[PDB]
Amino acid sequence: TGSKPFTVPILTVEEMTNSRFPIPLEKLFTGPSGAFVVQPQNGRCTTDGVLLGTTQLSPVNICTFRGDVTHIAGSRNYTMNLASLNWNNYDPTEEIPAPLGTPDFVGKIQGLLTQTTKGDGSTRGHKATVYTGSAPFTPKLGSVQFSTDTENDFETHQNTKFTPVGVIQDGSTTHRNEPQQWVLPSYSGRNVHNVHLAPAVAPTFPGEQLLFFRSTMPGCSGYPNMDLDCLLPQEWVQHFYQEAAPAQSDVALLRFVNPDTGRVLFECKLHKSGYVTVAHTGQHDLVIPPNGYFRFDSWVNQFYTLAPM
Amino acid sequence: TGSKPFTVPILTVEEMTNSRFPIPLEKLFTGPSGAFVVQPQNGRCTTDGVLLGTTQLSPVNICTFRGDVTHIAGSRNYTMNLASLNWNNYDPTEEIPAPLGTPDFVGKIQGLLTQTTKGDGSTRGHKATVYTGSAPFTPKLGSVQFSTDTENDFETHQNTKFTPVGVIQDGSTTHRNEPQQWVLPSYSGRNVHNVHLAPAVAPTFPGEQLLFFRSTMPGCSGYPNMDLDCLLPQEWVQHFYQEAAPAQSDVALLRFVNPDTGRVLFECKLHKSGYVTVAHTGQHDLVIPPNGYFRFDSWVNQFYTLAPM
Numbered sequence: 001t002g003s004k005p006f007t008v009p010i011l012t013v014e015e016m017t018n019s020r021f022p023i024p025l026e027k028l029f030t031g032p033s034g035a036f037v038v039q040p041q042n043g044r045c046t047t048d049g050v051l052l053g054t055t056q057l058s059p060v061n062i063c064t065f066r067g068d069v070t071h072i073a074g075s076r077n078y079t080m081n082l083a084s085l086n087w088n089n090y091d092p093t094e095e096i097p098a099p100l101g102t103p104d105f106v107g108k109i110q111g112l113l114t115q116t117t118k119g120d121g122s123t124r125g126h127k128a129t130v131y132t133g134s135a136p137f138t139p140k141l142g143s144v145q146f147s148t149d150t151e152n153d154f155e156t157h158q159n160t161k162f163t164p165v166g167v168i169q170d171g172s173t174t175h176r177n178e179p180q181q182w183v184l185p186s187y188s189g190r191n192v193h194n195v196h197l198a199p200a201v202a203p204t205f206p207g208e209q210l211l212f213f214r215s216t217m218p219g220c221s222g223y224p225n226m227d228l229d230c231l232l233p234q235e236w237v238q239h240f241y242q243e244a245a246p247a248q249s250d251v252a253l254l255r256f257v258n259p260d261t262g263r264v265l266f267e268c269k270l271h272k273s274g275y276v277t278v279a280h281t282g283q284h285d286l287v288i289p290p291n292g293y294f295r296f297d298s299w300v301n302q303f304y305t306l307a308p309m
Numbered sequence: 310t311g312s313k314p315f316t317v318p319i320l321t322v323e324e325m326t327n328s329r330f331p332i333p334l335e336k337l338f339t340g341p342s343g344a345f346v347v348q349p350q351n352g353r354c355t356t357d358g359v360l361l362g363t364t365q366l367s368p369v370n371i372c373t374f375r376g377d378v379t380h381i382a383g384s385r386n387y388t389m390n391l392a393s394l395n396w397n398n399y400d401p402t403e404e405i406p407a408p409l410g411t412p413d414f415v416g417k418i419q420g421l422l423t424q425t426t427k428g429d430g431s432t433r434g435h436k437a438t439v440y441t442g443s444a445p446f447t448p449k450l451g452s453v454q455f456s457t458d459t460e461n462d463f464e465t466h467q468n469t470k471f472t473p474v475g476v477i478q479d480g481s482t483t484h485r486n487e488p489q490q491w492v493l494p495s496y497s498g499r500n501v502h503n504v505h506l507a508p509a510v511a512p513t514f515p516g517e518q519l520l521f522f523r524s525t526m527p528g529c530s531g532y533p534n535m536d537l538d539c540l541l542p543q544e545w546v547q548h549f550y551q552e553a554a555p556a557q558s559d560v561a562l563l564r565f566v567n568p569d570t571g572r573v574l575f576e577c578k579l580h581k582s583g584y585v586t587v588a589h590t591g592q593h594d595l596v597i598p599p600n601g602y603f604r605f606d607s608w609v610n611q612f613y614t615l616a617p618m
């Protein structure tokens with residue numbers, strides 16, 4: 001009826017980026033999800049381009065922090081007073097769960113904390129870890145804590161950046177017990193309810209499962225669970241944001257096509273609120289050809305039955 | 310006609326990513342470049358979607374390395390035997406300058422070197438630096454060297470990744486003398502000339518300068534030069550690669566529009582071989598509205614006269 005035609009990118013899975021951590025996608029995965037709550041806040045976008053949760057457009061700002069730091073005496077810990085994505089004042093009253101790009105899982109994220117002194121352009125960088133399950137993790141309040149390897153090198157009142165690399169685990173405890181990718185941090189700290197969240201998703205149609213876009217996070221210490229599943233590639237977020245094509249039903253039928261043959265491998269539902277389901281029962285690593293890609297074919301309804309994956 | 314209509318993304322500058330290092334764009338910059346060679350190898354793509362140089366599609370696989378490492382006795386240095394993205398051996402006979410995403414400047418890039426032991430999922434991470442001007446920097450031959458902070462923690466024959474964060478400088482020497490963003494590394498080391506390069510670019514038309522998409526690399530030690538200019542945002546590379554719209558002339562005329570007024574701020578030439586020029590003489594940080602964007606207007610020839618920026 002004259003709506004702007006909806007499309008998805010023709011990039012292959014391996015040509016795209018995880019929307020929950022700045023690393024490439026590796027594979028597609030489906031499994032049952034009744035045993036956990038699927039409520040990530042990064043990689044959330046409606047098909048007509050409305051960003052949700054803490055989702056923002058940059059693949060390299062995910063799980064980053066910016067601001068200035070204060071040393072906590074008697075430790076190697078620094079409190080970062082957060083700034084916005086472009087180094088302006090952070091506004092805690094904005095109707096979002098936390099600063100855009102904030103991590104959306106409980107875990108210990110390791111990276112580098114870097115700093116420049118404005119006056120002379122001197123710089124410094126130190127390995128640092130943020131414990132997103134810890135009491136000082138209060139990004140919505142404008143404050144997070146980093147554990148570092150220095151007690152004096154960082155200066156006050158100078159622009160400071162955290163660049164994430166990977167995750168760690170406490171090797172004296174049960175292996176792969178953290179990170180917990182489906183447990184949201186408490187963005188305002190212990191026992192304070194989160195706000196303005198993108199909703200939890202579940203396959204609501206009988207016989208369906210979520211389809212996840214999966215990567216493996218680097219591990220930096222211990223025995224971490226390095227699996228990371230997102231609902232939408234970052235490139236799909238960027239694509240929908242720009243196109244802003246209106247959803248003509250609750251569900252977009254996508255076909256996964258092998259361009260080498262022109263043949264469809266499977267079909268799936270892209271729900272207009274921004275997640276994908278498939279008709280399958282059980283945990284399964286999808287085996288796909290390297291040049292395979294998703295193609296929008298038609299608008300269907302909540303009552304459409306998918307061909308079994 | 311019926312040729313596929315050419316477009317550029319409507320993402321704003323601050324919503325896009327530098328194509329030469331995994332950091333957000335900050336600003337537009339123009340300056341004279343007649344006195345030196347502008348020949349970056351990342352962020353090189355024709356308007357009809359042909360990747361050039363060492364350019365690849367991922368915003369987060371730029372200046373990364375992966376492979377396995379060997380310890381150099383009596384040092385904290387490790388040699389990395391490079392692998393491809395899916396962990397097979399790099400093939401030096403491919404007609405490219407170096408593995409795709411290899412750094413295209415001479416400098417000391419600091420980040421974290423991480424590793425997983427496959428047998429038990431144990432992991433480890435250490436601050437590391439690669440000096441792309443050094444004799445062991447031979448990515449085209451399949452080998453680079455890292456300086457780290459350990460002499461024994463990394464294991465042999467285990468998958469190892471370098472994630473870049475920023476750059477350093479030797480603070481006992483002249484400030485901001487490195488990195489040198491317009492000096493290409495020697496991809497095969499000492500005394501071997503580089504091959505299969507994307508060409509140098511220059512404005513030919515009187516009164517014109519290159520328009521650069523600029524970021525500030527994090528600094529991790531010393532007094533580095535942190536300016537980093539690319540010719541095309543990474544998102545434009547991804548866009549042209551997917552669209553593959555044929556060039557109807559040598560130059561796509563773009564207008565940069567201010568939505569708050571509906572008026573054009575400036576116009577520029579996007580050359581079909583993948584770079585932008587503007588009519589200006591001198592160094593200038595462009596002042597743009599946060600919601601400003603580029604819009605393709607028409608195909609013109611190389612000798613079209615732009616309104617002064």
Ligand SMILES: CC(=O)N[C@@H]1[C@@H](O)[C@H](O[C@@H]2O[C@H](CO)[C@H](O)[C@H](O)[C@H]2O[C@@H]2O[C@@H](C)[C@@H](O)[C@@H](O)[C@@H]2O)[C@@H](CO)O[C@@H]1O
Pocket residue numbers: 170171172173220221222223431432433434462
């Ligand atoms: C039972 C038990 O505690 N296991 C230990 C494990 O804790 C050790 O890991 C080191 O622990 C320290 C803290 O005391 C740091 O967290 C180190 O980063 C960590 O080493 C890293 O992870 C381990 C699993 C190895 O992969 C190592 O190469 C990494 O540097 C280890 C140290 O050898 O011993 C027992 O496994």
Ligand SMILES: CC(=O)N[C@@H]1[C@@H](O)[C@H](O[C@@H]2O[C@H](CO)[C@H](O)[C@H](O)[C@H]2O[C@@H]2O[C@@H](C)[C@@H](O)[C@@H](O)[C@@H]2O)[C@@H](CO)O[C@@H]1O
Pocket residue numbers: 122123124125153479480481482529530531532
């Ligand atoms: C005059 C002069 O040489 N300046 C020194 C400066 O070089 C020192 O910096 C350190 O140098 C060592 C190498 O010997 C390492 O590279 C350190 O990382 C480096 O410190 C870092 O950069 C300096 C400029 C500071 O920003 C510092 O905070 C960083 O950690 C310093 C040491 O403090 O002394 C003189 O400034």
